[PDB]
């Protein structure tokens, strides 16, 4: 059965980008997907998207502009100490200069740089670059 | 390794198929793996048909035929030149 909506959405997006399309559809419209897409948009990877209501798990449309190379999830949400982030950074991202790791905290959804600035930790959702 | 995608038979959407017997050795073979040819021929061969017609009395008498189905196993078909061993590229051709 369907479980991780975010994983299916990200996989569809990456497959569409690989053949250089411009528009995609994603059945689920969860809040977590919305925040993930908001962070992607603000950082400049996917530009625009819209949510299409239907009373039955609304659909969402997104636009592509290249740039994005990879994006995934971590299926069991680990717990990330505020001081234990460099190991995950090195293990997951290609370089320390660019890339964004998404953590969900008591202060909301943010990136590993922001949490490192506030010296707090939490749970990890995914990554992209 | 695998030599043929069909595994040497025509078996789709089933588990078991009825069996038959080879006509020259009487071996038991699955119906989807045996080699089949349909033939139609005259009872009297072609050289004596004219003599048969001249000796016949009925006017417009038509020579009756023979309708038979021959079934052979893999070993006997090869030994009697019913099929030929083909090259690796030519195994994928499916015309008569």
């Amino acid at each position: 059965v369907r479980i991780n909506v975010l994983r299916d959405a990200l996989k569809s997006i990456c497959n569409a980008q690989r053949i250089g399309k411009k528009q995609v559809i994603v059945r689920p419209s969860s809040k977590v997907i919305i925040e993930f897409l908001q962070l992607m948009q603000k950082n400049g990877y996917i530009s625009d998207f819209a949510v299409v209501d239907n009373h039955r798990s609304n659909r969402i449309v997104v636009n592509l502009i290249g740039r994005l190379n990879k994006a995934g999830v971590i299926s069991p949400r680990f717990d990330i100490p505020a001081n234990d982030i460099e190991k995950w950074v090195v293990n997951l991202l290609p370089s320390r200069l660019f890339g964004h790791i998404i953590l969900t905290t008591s202060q909301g959804i943010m990136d590993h740089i922001e949490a490192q600035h506030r010296q707090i930790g939490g749970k990890v959702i995914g990554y992209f670059y | 390794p695998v030599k043929r995608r069909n595994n040497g038979r025509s078996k789709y959407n089933c588990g078991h198929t009825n069996i038959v017997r080879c006509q020259n050795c009487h071996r038991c073979v699955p119906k989807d793996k045996v080699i089949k040819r349909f033939t139609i021929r005259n009872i009297v061969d072609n050289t004596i048909a004219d003599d048969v017609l001249n000796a016949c009395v009925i006017q417009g008498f038509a020579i009756p035929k023979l309708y038979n189905k021959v079934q052979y196993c893999v070993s006997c078909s090869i030994h009697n030149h019913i099929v030929r061993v083909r090259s690796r590229e030519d195994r994928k051709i499916r015309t008569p």
């Binding site: 400049g44 290249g66 740039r67 190379n69 290609p94 370089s95 320390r96 200069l97 660019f98 | -």
Partner: protein, 209 residues
């Protein structure tokens, strides 16, 4: 006698119309003449090494027929590396063919900084991977002063390519030299085809060339 170019690129190179090899790489033109690379390297700055020499046999009606295969690399220790192979009945001609082929194909190696940006680049831009046969290679950026953490054979390639600090990981049957060198070569070749955000800037094309 003299070098009579057999190609439009060769003629343009003989003339002083083209001024840098980077001016060639930017448009992905195939190279067929070995004279083109010495013109840009008049003083023979490029190095050379012979990684391996193996003998291959073919069974025949009467005994065996033997042959020799050789692998060669070349680089100037500054962002340029090439790999090539050659096979012949005699060792020396095989080596000459391998050297010619290695010189023929050449690629630039992109380099970057680990954390602090001070001075010239000292390591690879980011994570790079290559695949040839069963062997896989991973190149990881490293801090300054870390040296080259790799086997002697791979370290030779990274030295001839002009790197100073890097971590490496290997997998598969690494005892097969050709495929290890090929995997590292492919990883290095991929370096300049990897998009990074600083290259997101939108540049209009140029009609000339």
């Amino acid at each position: 006698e003299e070098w009579h170019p057999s190609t439009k690129l060769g003629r343009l190179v003989k003339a002083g119309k083209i001024e840098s090899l980077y001016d060639i790489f930017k448009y992905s033109l195939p190279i067929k003449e070995t004279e083109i690379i010495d013109y840009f390297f008049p003083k023979s700055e490029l190095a050379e090494e012979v990684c391996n020499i193996m003998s291959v046999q073919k069974q025949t009606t009467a005994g065996q027929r033997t042959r020799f295969r050789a692998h060669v690399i070349v680089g100037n220790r500054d962002g340029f590396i090439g790999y090539g192979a050659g096979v012949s009945k005699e060792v020396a001609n095989a080596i000459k063919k391998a050297a010619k082929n290695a010189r023929l194909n050449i690629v630039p190696v992109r380099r970057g900084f680990w954390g602090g940006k001070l001075g010239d680049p000292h390591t690879v831009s980011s994570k790079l991977s290559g695949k040839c046969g069963s062997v896989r290679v991973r190149l990881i950026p490293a801090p300054r002063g870390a040296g080259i953490v790799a086997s002697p054979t791979v370290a030779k390639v990274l030295e001839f390519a002009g790197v100073s600090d890097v971590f490496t990981r290997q997998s598969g049957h690494s005892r097969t030299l050709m495929n290890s060198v090929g995997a590292v070569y492919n990883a290095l070749k991929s370096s300049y085809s990897i998009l990074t955000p600083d290259l997101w800037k939108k540049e209009q094309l140029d009609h000339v060339q």
